[PDB]
């Protein structure tokens, strides 16, 4: 059984926490249910930290208490259908491969599935490891509940000997790299600089070897990434997000400066030596968008290439950890202000951005974010119940599952099948402008071969290429995106019609050099 | 927000309690969770109490940390037909009202409902307060959170300016008393002396007005009842069954002395002063059986009369309060230890006894009880999830609503629709003899005033009347006990033949000396 | 509320109508249901229109006298999947726009 | 529930390896007709005729058999991304060819 310590021998040292402690929700939580630091403290100076203490960060520590959350949290949507390829005819994008040819995505990119999995399946996935991580059988990928007792429960390593990013498997990549476990974990928390910066008292940074790195890690999806475990209230600690609400002075909502005033962020930086080593975000509210913006959103991760001279952008620079906090309609400029692209593609030559699941973002200007709503509203609302006390789901999924919270508790107008109704209006018809993009742009990809082959000149092709940025960004959105358009059809509309009208221009432009040359 | 106080200031006093507090599994859990004690440790010494602290028995107490359990436990079964009376054609007892004319049960017997309502539901029958506590308005029956909130925020009192016991409504009797409400709230565990002996440190006690004591108690079932708050260990605290098992020196078990000893009882008291003053039963085990023998027993509570002599026992005498502890077979001989009965039959004159509840008393000795299972196993049985933390379910209920979890993990041979099918066959046959029991004792009443006014001796009379105590005793047994024969059909069986036997031979006896004045 | 007019005056120029009207199972049901004449039938001619009557098209004057009819007309079937574009790979014409390119 | 995802795990995964095999074979296939017509030898297409035998045993195995990989995921992902490894290298034959014949 917990015996607990005295918490003011800690706050003697550490005056941050006792101010966040002693004043929130969490004051009468001792410190042992979460920390054993009886040798620190027989060691620990104001200034050096002497043995370094344990501090648990499994979910389970918050179980003991909000037993409800974390089995809302912890359940297995069986109808968000596992390991199903997106570049397929009956998934998101049937075009996808050849879209997306000479980027790592083409040798895996799956739908998302349900929170638990999370860590395990960036573990798994062909496009991350070589295949180097499997589950331990084909069984084990049921077992959510495994899962966030830790990954190496149910997961092996082909060859434990070895720390090198190398192909198992033929048809894998080796895309993972450690910034991408920022949005999978924060087991890393106290080993990991602001940023993954190098610094002295960091285990890990952007340029460390992601294999012995991803040994390190567990659990998905903490909770203590929303909530902070010392006052109890709302944050986020995601560096990127944190870099440009506050340190870029962009704002939490960039669109609206009244707004962002209300629903702010406040910076807490935490030392090592009495140097700045890492942060959190502090939220004026408990703000969904906000919160889940610390990962639904378009980011860097990964390591690219200069549009000013085509140059290596590598892991140690600050961009291969960036978030863009940009609509679709300001993303290029975004991009161009850091001078960064993606990757060319394999056919056209064309340097192209790659997009990551911007819901946030897209989120901005919509009817619904306008009108205050924001994501928990529809995907963890309030539980319903006849005799009870009312707690927050934490189950984050499709609000079909729940629409009498979800939605037809504000639309008292509609029946539940009128509501899902409108949902499928607007997801078919975004879609099928998703698949009409894609035509125009393959379209466009198979007049490249015929023209370099035909003879036209490296001025034309460049212009098409210019052109294929375009088509390619105000496409590949909305496929990232995990809405279908639900979230802001208008911007989908408006978006998708530029990215066919691009590649129309392209087309034209290709087979009118096209027939110049052979005439 | 709650500010936690220095629990080691308290044991510098309260050494009782940290013996408790510090071994448990609520070491971690500050005082400031359960008591406000601020002017009590301004005022007090350790032989001197000062001013008295604040101690909380609500039940939210326990949900911040419990949600889960406590969800459970106010959960409302609707189908649990709510305020259903016994006495007519449909229901447990047909012939109800001729059996016990003479007791007050004839005004009002409903079926039971969930615990949410047992205080609420004690407080307006028409056969406990004359009809002084009603529901606010009808709309308030439904609600379950509300009740266990408190009793006062759904329910008004005809005249809050006086406090004797009377009728507002004529058909209503006046039954209730203060060692009731010991199975309905521990409210008062602080300020009720064991037993509830006059005592000066006790507030109230069984000679108390009941209806000063009803306005002074709010929450149905405490959490407490089965968990000390301190040691969050398995105990009871109801001052019948501890005198009953311990006291006494029955046992948990009174036909199995070896389970007895490994699933025992400790009587710990606590003082006022020099003098002791309440207890609490800390158990071997988390026994289920001995937990819900608090308030599932056929018992004492209430007035009545000596076998003896017929003299008056009122509620000055510790017989008010009393657990017999005894099964069907043995009931007579326990009644006679103490030399009491409850009621003289309005038409025949028999001294009678009452029977309550006798589920504890019935399950001993039975297939499954002899097999080691225990009350919880079939109604409030742990909870089955795909993936998540499993708790034991707290919604103590027929296990018709959890067949998989209840039944059906023992019991693989059979499907759901078996299982029901032998529960009904058992219930089917016992309610058959019940019926036929009440038949005969029926046939029996009728014919009292036909031998009273052909001019029957006393003698014969009396003799007969022996014969009804007998008769009654085993039938009520199994109308008073809530399984309908399930939790021992046996001795149902054997019990009920015995009590259509015991009025066959009152008849002959009856019609015989009826036919002889004649003739 | 409305008040019938005068089928016989409208007839006395409508010879067509009167031979419809006046034979189905429409012959008690009253033009003002379906039509506002007044200043037509002041200032037309046997062959001139005069003023233009006012004509209802609307399906709620059929719904008066046939509320069932129309209820199940207006019903929405929301099992229709709505602007479901055919030219995708799970509908009628997955090539669709390589087959019709040219046209709108 | 947890029984059916089981299954529809190992099908979704095959699904879209097969998918992925025959994007990478048609890709193949198409070259052909190019090749010929842009003059490329008879002892380069028969080369990619021999690579094409191996692209397609490892793929059509698995749109013949009907378990969608249930059978033998294990087995199913090896020949899927052996088919797609043939058919990559037939590609890179036939337009390296294909581009000597032009230049
Ligand atoms: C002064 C002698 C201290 C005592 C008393 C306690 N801690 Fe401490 N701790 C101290 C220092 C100088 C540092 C390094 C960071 C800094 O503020 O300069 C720490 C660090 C921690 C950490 C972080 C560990 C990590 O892996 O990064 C934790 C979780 C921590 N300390 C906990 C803790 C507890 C629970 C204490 C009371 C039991 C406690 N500390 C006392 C200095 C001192
Ligand atoms: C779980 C409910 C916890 C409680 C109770 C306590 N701590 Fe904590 N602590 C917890 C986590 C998950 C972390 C990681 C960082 C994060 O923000 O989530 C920490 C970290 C600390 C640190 C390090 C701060 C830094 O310099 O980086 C310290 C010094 C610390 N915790 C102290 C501390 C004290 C003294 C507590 C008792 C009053 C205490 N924590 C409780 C989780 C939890
Ligand atoms: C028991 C020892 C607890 C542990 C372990 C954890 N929490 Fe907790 N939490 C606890 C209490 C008694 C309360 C106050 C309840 C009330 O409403 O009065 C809380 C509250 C929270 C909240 C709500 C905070 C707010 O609204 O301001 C959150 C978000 C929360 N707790 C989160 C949380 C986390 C993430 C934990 C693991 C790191 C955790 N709690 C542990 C008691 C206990
Ligand atoms: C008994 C005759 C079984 C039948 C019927 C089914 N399964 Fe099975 N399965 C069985 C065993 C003994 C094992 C090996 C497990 C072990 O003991 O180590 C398995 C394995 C699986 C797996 C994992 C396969 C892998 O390649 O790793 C799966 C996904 C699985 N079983 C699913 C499954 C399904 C869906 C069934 C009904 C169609 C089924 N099994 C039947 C034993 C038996
Ligand atoms: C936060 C800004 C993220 C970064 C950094 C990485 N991922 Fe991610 N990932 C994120 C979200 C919000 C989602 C769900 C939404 C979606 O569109 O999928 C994911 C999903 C995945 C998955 C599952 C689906 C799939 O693509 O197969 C995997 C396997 C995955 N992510 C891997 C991955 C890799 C390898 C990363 C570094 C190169 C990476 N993620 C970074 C959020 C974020
Ligand atoms: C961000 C993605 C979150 C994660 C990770 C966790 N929680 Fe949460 N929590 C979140 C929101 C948006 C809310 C509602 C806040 C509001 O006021 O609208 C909550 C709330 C809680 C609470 C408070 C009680 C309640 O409303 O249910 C608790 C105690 C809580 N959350 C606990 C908790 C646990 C145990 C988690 C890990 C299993 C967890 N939270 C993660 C957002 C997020
Ligand atoms: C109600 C007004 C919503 C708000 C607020 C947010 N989302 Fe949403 N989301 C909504 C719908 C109707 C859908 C389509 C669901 C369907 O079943 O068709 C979605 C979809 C998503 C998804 C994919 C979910 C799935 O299909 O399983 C994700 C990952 C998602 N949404 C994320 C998300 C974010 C991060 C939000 C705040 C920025 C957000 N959603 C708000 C409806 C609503
Ligand atoms: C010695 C100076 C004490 C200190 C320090 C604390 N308590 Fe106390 N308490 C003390 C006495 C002498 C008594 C009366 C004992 C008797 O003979 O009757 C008490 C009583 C209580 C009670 C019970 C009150 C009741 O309703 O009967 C409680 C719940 C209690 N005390 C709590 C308590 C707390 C939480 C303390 C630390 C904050 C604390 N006490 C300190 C003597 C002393
Ligand atoms: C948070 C501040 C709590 C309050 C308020 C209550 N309980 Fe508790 N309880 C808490 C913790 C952290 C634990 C240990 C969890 C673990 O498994 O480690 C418990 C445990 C219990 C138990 C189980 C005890 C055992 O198995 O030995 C019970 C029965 C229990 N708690 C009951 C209970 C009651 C009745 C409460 C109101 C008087 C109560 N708890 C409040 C945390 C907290
Ligand atoms: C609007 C036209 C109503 C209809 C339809 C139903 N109810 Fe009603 N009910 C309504 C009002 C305005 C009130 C009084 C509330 C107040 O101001 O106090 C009620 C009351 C009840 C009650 C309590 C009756 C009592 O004597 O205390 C019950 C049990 C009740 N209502 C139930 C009920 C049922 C079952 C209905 C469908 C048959 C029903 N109501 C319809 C308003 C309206
Ligand atoms: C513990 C030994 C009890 C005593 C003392 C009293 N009651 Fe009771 N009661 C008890 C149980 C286990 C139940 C549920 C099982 C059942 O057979 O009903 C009840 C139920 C009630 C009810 C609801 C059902 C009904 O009879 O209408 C009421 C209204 C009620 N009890 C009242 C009541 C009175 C007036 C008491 C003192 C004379 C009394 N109870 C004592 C357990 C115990
Ligand atoms: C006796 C009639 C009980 C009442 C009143 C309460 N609980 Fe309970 N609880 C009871 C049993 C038989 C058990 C299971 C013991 C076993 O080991 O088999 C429990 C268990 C708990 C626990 C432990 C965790 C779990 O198994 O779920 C907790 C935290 C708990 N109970 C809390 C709790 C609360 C909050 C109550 C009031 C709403 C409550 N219990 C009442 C029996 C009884
Ligand atoms: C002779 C003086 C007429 C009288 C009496 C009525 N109508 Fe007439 N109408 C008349 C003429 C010459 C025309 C033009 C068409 C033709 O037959 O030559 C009309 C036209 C109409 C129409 C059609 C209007 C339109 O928008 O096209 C309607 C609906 C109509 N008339 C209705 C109508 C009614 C209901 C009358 C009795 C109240 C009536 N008319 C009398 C000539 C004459
Ligand atoms: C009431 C004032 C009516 C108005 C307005 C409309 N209709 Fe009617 N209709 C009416 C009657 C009394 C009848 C006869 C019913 C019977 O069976 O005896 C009808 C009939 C029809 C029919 C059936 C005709 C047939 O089978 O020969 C149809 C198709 C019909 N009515 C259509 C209809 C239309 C389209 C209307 C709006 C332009 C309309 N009716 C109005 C009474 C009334
Ligand atoms: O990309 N995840
Ligand atoms: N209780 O009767
Ligand atoms: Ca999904
Ligand atoms: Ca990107
Ligand atoms: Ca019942
Ligand atoms: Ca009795």
Request: net charge negative.
């Amino acid at each position: 059984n917990l015996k607990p310590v005295d918490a003011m021998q800690c706050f003697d040292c550490h005056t941050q926490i006792e101010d966040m402690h002693t004043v929130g929700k969490h004051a009468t939580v001792n410190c042992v249910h979460c920390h054993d630091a009886t040798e620190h403290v027989e060691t620990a100076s104001s200034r050096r930290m002497g043995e370094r203490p344990v501090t648990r960060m499994d979910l389970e520590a918050c179980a003991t208490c909000h037993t409800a959350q974390f089995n809302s949290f912890v359940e297995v949507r069986h109808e968000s259908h596992p390991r199903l390829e997106k570049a397929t005819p009956t998934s998101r994008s049937p075009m996808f491969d050849k879209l997306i040819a000479g980027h790592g995505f083409a040798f895996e990119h799956a739908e998302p599935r349900s929170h638990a999995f999370m860590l395990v399946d960036h573990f798994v996935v062909d496009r991350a490891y070589g295949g180097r991580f499997q589950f331990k059988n084909w069984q084990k990928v049921t077992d959510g509940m495994g899962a966030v007792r830790g990954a190496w429960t149910v997961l092996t390593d082909a060859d434990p000997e070895s720390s090198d990013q190398r192909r198992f498997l033929s048809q894998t990549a080796t895309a993972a790299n450690p910034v991408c476990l920022n949005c999978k974990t924060q087991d890393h928390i106290l080993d990991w600089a602001y940023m993954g910066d190098e610094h002295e008292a960091a285990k890990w940074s952007r340029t460390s070897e992601v294999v012995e790195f991803a040994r390190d890690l567990n659990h998905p999806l903490n909770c203590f990434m929303c909530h902070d475990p010392h006052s109890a209230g709302p944050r986020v600690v995601r560096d990127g997000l944190i870099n440009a609400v506050v340190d870029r002075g962009l704002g939490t909502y960039p669109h609206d400066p009244v707004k962002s005033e209300q629903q702010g962020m406040t910076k807490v930086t935490f030392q090592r030596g009495r140097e700045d080593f890492r942060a959190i975000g502090l939220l004026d509210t408990a703000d969904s968008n906000v919160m889940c913006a610390q990962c639904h959103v378009e980011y860097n991760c990964n390591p690219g290439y200069q549009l000013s001279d085509g140059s290596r952008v590598g892991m140690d620079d600050r961009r291969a950890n960036h978030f863009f906090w940009a609509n679709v309609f300001d993303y290029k400029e975004a991009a161009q202000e850091i001078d960064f692209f993606d990757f060319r593609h394999a056919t056209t030559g064309a340097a192209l951005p790659k997009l990551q699941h911007p819901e946030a973002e897209t989120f901005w200007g919509s009817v619904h974010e306008r009108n205050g709503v924001a994501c928990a509203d529809c995907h963890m609302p309030k539980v319903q119940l006849e005799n009870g006390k009312v707690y927050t789901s934490h189950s984050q999924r499709t609000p079909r599952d729940m629409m009498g919270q979800a939605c037809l508790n504000c639309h008292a107008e509609w029946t539940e099948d009128q509501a899902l109704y409108a949902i499928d209006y607007i997801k078919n018809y975004t879609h099928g402008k998703i698949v009409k993009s894609e035509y125009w742009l393959a379209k466009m990809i198979d007049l490249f071969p015929v023209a370099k082959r035909a003879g036209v000149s490296e001025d034309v092709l460049n212009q098409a290429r210019e052109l294929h940025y375009d088509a390619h960004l105000y496409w590949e959105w909305w496929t990232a995106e995990n809405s279908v358009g639900f979230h802001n059809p208008d911007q989908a509309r408006e978006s998708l019609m530029t990215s066919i009208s691009k590649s129309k221009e392209a087309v034209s432009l290709l087979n009118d050099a096209i027939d110049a040359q052979v005439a």
